[PDB]
Chain A
């Protein structure tokens, strides 16, 4: 009961959530936000 109930479902929940987060990051809206962060840090490195 514990192995199938507590541990197996914990395995599934982490897997499903991990897949959803992976797809979320690659949406067009999120990519632009990360790209802005990259360019700002490059400017800071160049300015430094």
Chain B
């Protein structure tokens, strides 16, 4: 029984997904440069917020109030769902004051991970033309990224296989 209407923030939070996987040097370098430009060129009308915790657990048709109080000692009461649920309406609050907002979520890496949620945000893609370029770009950092280079590549082509639309 999907409602014909859904509640969404007034104006879209800006979520830009890294080419392979956030939290690493090569990916983090990609967004911070864009983070700098949006703050400088568009100063006084853009607010930047970082979502340190998870944001992929945005559910609306699970239960009336899972973990309403922290004294229930329930499995979900002491879990991280309570804080993630509280972070949803903060994005709503930033939207109502007419200033555009962005999301520095360090966990979501796919469009479908944050597509069915009530956020329905603007998705920005930064990608390299070929994986041949990406592997050498990773090499330009140093030996530290060589340990995680393997997991760095399967996380890249997965996003490419997602439809552009």
Contact = CB atoms under 8 A, between A and B. Distances in A.
B34 interface: no
A22 to B, nearest CB: 32
A47 B132 CA distance: 9
Contacts of A47: 133, 136-137
- Main secondary structure, interface of B, reads helix
B130 interface: yes
A43 to B, nearest CB: 5
Interface size, A (range): under 10
Interface in A1-45: 43
Interface size, B (range): under 10
Contacts of B130: 43, 46
A43 B130 CA distance: 8
B115 to A, nearest CB: 29
B81 to A, nearest CB: 42
A47 B130 CA distance: 10
A13 to B, nearest CB: 44
Interface string B117-133: 00000000000111011
A33 to B, nearest CB: 18
Contacts of A46: 128-130, 133
Interface of B: 128-130, 132-133, 136-137
11 contacts: A43-B130, A43-B132, A43-B133, A43-B136, A46-B128, A46-B129, A46-B130, A46-B133, A47-B133, A47-B136, A47-B137
